Design an enzyme around this catalytic site. Structure first.
Site, PDB file in Angstrom:
ATOM      1  N   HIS A   1      -5.159   4.166  -2.000  1.00 27.43           N
ATOM      2  CA  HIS A   1      -6.413   4.758  -1.552  1.00 27.43           C
ATOM      3  C   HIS A   1      -6.575   6.118  -2.212  1.00 27.43           C
ATOM      4  O   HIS A   1      -5.704   6.989  -2.075  1.00 27.43           O
ATOM      5  CB  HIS A   1      -6.429   4.889  -0.024  1.00 27.43           C
ATOM      6  CG  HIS A   1      -7.761   5.244   0.573  1.00 27.43           C
ATOM      7  ND1 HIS A   1      -8.693   6.025  -0.077  1.00 27.43           N
ATOM      8  CD2 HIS A   1      -8.275   4.996   1.798  1.00 27.43           C
ATOM      9  CE1 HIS A   1      -9.744   6.200   0.701  1.00 27.43           C
ATOM     10  NE2 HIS A   1      -9.510   5.595   1.848  1.00 27.43           N
TER      11      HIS A   1
ATOM     12  N   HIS B   1       1.437   5.996   1.836  1.00 31.63           N
ATOM     13  CA  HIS B   1       2.271   6.883   2.615  1.00 31.63           C
ATOM     14  C   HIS B   1       3.554   7.258   1.912  1.00 31.63           C
ATOM     15  O   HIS B   1       4.264   8.139   2.402  1.00 31.63           O
ATOM     16  CB  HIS B   1       2.549   6.271   3.965  1.00 31.63           C
ATOM     17  CG  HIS B   1       1.365   6.299   4.857  1.00 31.63           C
ATOM     18  ND1 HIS B   1       1.362   5.730   6.109  1.00 31.63           N
ATOM     19  CD2 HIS B   1       0.149   6.873   4.694  1.00 31.63           C
ATOM     20  CE1 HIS B   1       0.180   5.923   6.668  1.00 31.63           C
ATOM     21  NE2 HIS B   1      -0.570   6.627   5.836  1.00 31.63           N
TER      22      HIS B   1
ATOM     23  N   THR C   1     -17.730   1.481  15.004  1.00 31.89           N
ATOM     24  CA  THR C   1     -16.879   1.848  16.131  1.00 31.89           C
ATOM     25  C   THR C   1     -15.479   1.265  15.992  1.00 31.89           C
ATOM     26  O   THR C   1     -14.480   1.973  16.171  1.00 31.89           O
ATOM     27  CB  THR C   1     -17.512   1.387  17.438  1.00 31.89           C
ATOM     28  OG1 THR C   1     -18.819   1.958  17.554  1.00 31.89           O
ATOM     29  CG2 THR C   1     -16.654   1.832  18.622  1.00 31.89           C
TER      30      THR C   1
ATOM     31  N   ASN D   1       0.832  -1.206   0.000  1.00 31.66           N
ATOM     32  CA  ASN D   1       0.000   0.000   0.000  1.00 31.66           C
ATOM     33  C   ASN D   1       0.874   1.268   0.000  1.00 31.66           C
ATOM     34  O   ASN D   1       1.375   1.693   1.050  1.00 31.66           O
ATOM     35  CB  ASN D   1      -0.924  -0.079   1.208  1.00 31.66           C
ATOM     36  CG  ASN D   1      -1.887   1.079   1.316  1.00 31.66           C
ATOM     37  OD1 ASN D   1      -1.733   2.094   0.662  1.00 31.66           O
ATOM     38  ND2 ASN D   1      -2.932   0.895   2.115  1.00 31.66           N
TER      39      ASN D   1
ATOM     40  N   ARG E   1      -5.238  14.346  -0.358  1.00 31.63           N
ATOM     41  CA  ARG E   1      -4.076  14.829   0.375  1.00 31.63           C
ATOM     42  C   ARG E   1      -2.806  14.093  -0.042  1.00 31.63           C
ATOM     43  O   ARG E   1      -1.715  14.675  -0.010  1.00 31.63           O
ATOM     44  CB  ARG E   1      -4.314  14.712   1.884  1.00 31.63           C
ATOM     45  CG  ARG E   1      -5.227  13.569   2.263  1.00 31.63           C
ATOM     46  CD  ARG E   1      -5.218  13.271   3.757  1.00 31.63           C
ATOM     47  NE  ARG E   1      -5.978  12.049   4.015  1.00 31.63           N
ATOM     48  CZ  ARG E   1      -7.263  12.015   4.365  1.00 31.63           C
ATOM     49  NH1 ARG E   1      -7.936  13.143   4.544  1.00 31.63           N
ATOM     50  NH2 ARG E   1      -7.877  10.853   4.545  1.00 31.63           N
ATOM     51  N   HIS E   2      -2.927  12.822  -0.438  1.00 27.99           N
ATOM     52  CA  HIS E   2      -1.764  12.001  -0.762  1.00 27.99           C
ATOM     53  C   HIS E   2      -1.855  11.415  -2.174  1.00 27.99           C
ATOM     54  O   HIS E   2      -1.439  12.070  -3.128  1.00 27.99           O
ATOM     55  CB  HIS E   2      -1.567  10.907   0.298  1.00 27.99           C
ATOM     56  CG  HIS E   2      -1.472  11.424   1.709  1.00 27.99           C
ATOM     57  ND1 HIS E   2      -1.024  10.642   2.753  1.00 27.99           N
ATOM     58  CD2 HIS E   2      -1.714  12.647   2.241  1.00 27.99           C
ATOM     59  CE1 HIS E   2      -1.039  11.349   3.870  1.00 27.99           C
ATOM     60  NE2 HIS E   2      -1.444  12.573   3.584  1.00 27.99           N
TER      61      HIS E   2
ATOM     62  N   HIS F   1      -4.831  -4.397   7.361  1.00 29.11           N
ATOM     63  CA  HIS F   1      -4.624  -3.054   7.854  1.00 29.11           C
ATOM     64  C   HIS F   1      -4.129  -3.119   9.293  1.00 29.11           C
ATOM     65  O   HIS F   1      -4.815  -3.643  10.174  1.00 29.11           O
ATOM     66  CB  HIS F   1      -5.907  -2.251   7.749  1.00 29.11           C
ATOM     67  CG  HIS F   1      -5.826  -0.934   8.425  1.00 29.11           C
ATOM     68  ND1 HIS F   1      -5.607  -0.804   9.781  1.00 29.11           N
ATOM     69  CD2 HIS F   1      -5.933   0.317   7.936  1.00 29.11           C
ATOM     70  CE1 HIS F   1      -5.563   0.474  10.099  1.00 29.11           C
ATOM     71  NE2 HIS F   1      -5.762   1.176   8.998  1.00 29.11           N
TER      72      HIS F   1
ATOM     73  N   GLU G   1     -12.143  -7.898   3.465  1.00 37.87           N
ATOM     74  CA  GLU G   1     -10.828  -7.649   4.046  1.00 37.87           C
ATOM     75  C   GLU G   1     -11.053  -7.443   5.530  1.00 37.87           C
ATOM     76  O   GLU G   1     -11.709  -6.478   5.928  1.00 37.87           O
ATOM     77  CB  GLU G   1     -10.129  -6.436   3.434  1.00 37.87           C
ATOM     78  CG  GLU G   1      -8.675  -6.366   3.854  1.00 37.87           C
ATOM     79  CD  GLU G   1      -7.935  -5.116   3.440  1.00 37.87           C
ATOM     80  OE1 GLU G   1      -7.362  -4.488   4.359  1.00 37.87           O
ATOM     81  OE2 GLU G   1      -7.890  -4.791   2.221  1.00 37.87           O
TER      82      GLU G   1
ATOM     83  N   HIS H   1       1.490   0.939   6.040  1.00 34.00           N
ATOM     84  CA  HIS H   1       2.252   1.868   6.843  1.00 34.00           C
ATOM     85  C   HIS H   1       3.494   1.247   7.469  1.00 34.00           C
ATOM     86  O   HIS H   1       4.504   1.930   7.647  1.00 34.00           O
ATOM     87  CB  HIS H   1       1.364   2.466   7.911  1.00 34.00           C
ATOM     88  CG  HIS H   1       2.133   3.213   8.932  1.00 34.00           C
ATOM     89  ND1 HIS H   1       2.801   4.382   8.635  1.00 34.00           N
ATOM     90  CD2 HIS H   1       2.347   2.974  10.242  1.00 34.00           C
ATOM     91  CE1 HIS H   1       3.410   4.822   9.719  1.00 34.00           C
ATOM     92  NE2 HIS H   1       3.149   3.989  10.709  1.00 34.00           N
TER      93      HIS H   1
ATOM     94  N   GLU I   1      -8.491   1.270  -3.243  1.00 38.03           N
ATOM     95  CA  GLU I   1      -9.277   1.556  -2.045  1.00 38.03           C
ATOM     96  C   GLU I   1     -10.086   2.827  -2.267  1.00 38.03           C
ATOM     97  O   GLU I   1      -9.536   3.842  -2.689  1.00 38.03           O
ATOM     98  CB  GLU I   1      -8.370   1.733  -0.836  1.00 38.03           C
ATOM     99  CG  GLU I   1      -8.563   0.720   0.257  1.00 38.03           C
ATOM    100  CD  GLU I   1      -7.446   0.748   1.300  1.00 38.03           C
ATOM    101  OE1 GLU I   1      -7.171   1.825   1.888  1.00 38.03           O
ATOM    102  OE2 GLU I   1      -6.820  -0.320   1.503  1.00 38.03           O
TER     103      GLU I   1
ATOM    104  N   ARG J   1      -8.561   9.063  -1.726  1.00 38.14           N
ATOM    105  CA  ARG J   1      -9.406   9.928  -0.932  1.00 38.14           C
ATOM    106  C   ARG J   1      -9.906  11.065  -1.811  1.00 38.14           C
ATOM    107  O   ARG J   1      -9.291  11.394  -2.829  1.00 38.14           O
ATOM    108  CB  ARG J   1      -8.607  10.436   0.270  1.00 38.14           C
ATOM    109  CG  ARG J   1      -7.541   9.420   0.646  1.00 38.14           C
ATOM    110  CD  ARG J   1      -6.594   9.853   1.751  1.00 38.14           C
ATOM    111  NE  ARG J   1      -5.510   8.881   2.034  1.00 38.14           N
ATOM    112  CZ  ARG J   1      -4.400   8.713   1.299  1.00 38.14           C
ATOM    113  NH1 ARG J   1      -4.215   9.385   0.167  1.00 38.14           N
ATOM    114  NH2 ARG J   1      -3.485   7.841   1.673  1.00 38.14           N
TER     115      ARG J   1
END
Length: 242
Positions: free
Chosen positions: A44, A11, A102, A8, A50-51, A192, A152, A215, A71, A46
């Protein structure tokens, strides 16, 4: 059949955008990762952007030798993007606000129809949908009902576990859910949160098809170089399973 590794590179594009230059280029990072043991590359998209960005996706799609795992949040914007992009895999995750649990997986049970539509649109596009859920019978029954081939299983709780008791509890919860999920014809991915000390037990769960990790690998890459970090993770899985 051997479990696959999906890296992934989110990052990596974080470092890139912190001065908004070009390097390190996620296109270059996937190349390295694929030649070091990875069986797929996850990114991913988004809406914040941002990335990872649309350019990353547009080019990654043309340069991977493997298979993309896109993703995305089940949103009309993304469902649309998913379809022209025709990624091989496509993993649905909650987004910012009311779509999450949650523990933090996509609430399928509580969005049954949203997902049934999403899963159908995408299967009609040729992309195998994975549903990112906690290990709850409720959500797994929901996952199967809605027609997604894959789930997943969110191993966040397993990684965050403090005492060994809590770690073992969450391990068994995952293994039992992986069995139950397979019993309903679902294929099972996880990952994850997985680190280089978590990964082995999860890889031994034989229902597991593919571990998608980010990560922790990128974190080690900064120390050792990305090639050695992908290879270290992959070799740990082959150990855990033969």
């Amino acid at each position: 059949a051997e479990l696959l590794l999906g890296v992934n590179i989110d990052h990596i594009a974080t470092l890139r955008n912190a001065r908004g230059t070009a390097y390190p280029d996620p296109v270059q990072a996937a190349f390295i990762a694929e030649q070091a043991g990875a069986d797929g590359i996850t990114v991913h998209l988004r809406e914040d952007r941002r990335h990872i960005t649309d350019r990353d996706v547009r080019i990654l799609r043309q340069t991977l030798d493997t298979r993309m795992n896109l993703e995305m949040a089940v949103t009309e914007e993304m469902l649309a993007i998913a379809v022209e992009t025709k990624p091989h895999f496509c993993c649905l995750v909650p987004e910012k606000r009311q779509e999450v649990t949650t523990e933090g997986g996509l609430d399928v049970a509580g969005q049954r129809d949203k997902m049934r539509d999403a899963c159908k649109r995408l299967a009609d596009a040729g992309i195998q949908v994975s549903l990112f859920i906690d290990a709850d019978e409720e959500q797994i029954k929901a996952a199967a009902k809605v027609g997604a081939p894959f789930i997943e299983i969110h191993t966040g709780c397993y990684a965050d576990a403090k005492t060994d008791a809590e770690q073992a509890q969450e391990l068994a919860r995952i293994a039992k859910a992986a069995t139950f999920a397979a019993s309903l014809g679902l294929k099972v991915n996880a990952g994850h949160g997985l680190t280089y000390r978590n990964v082995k037990a999860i890889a031994a769960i034989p229902e597991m098809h593919e571990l998608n990790i980010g990560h922790a690998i990128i974190g080690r890459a900064v120390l050792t170089g990305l090639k050695v970090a992908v290879a270290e993770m992959k070799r740990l899985m082959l150990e855990a399973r033969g």
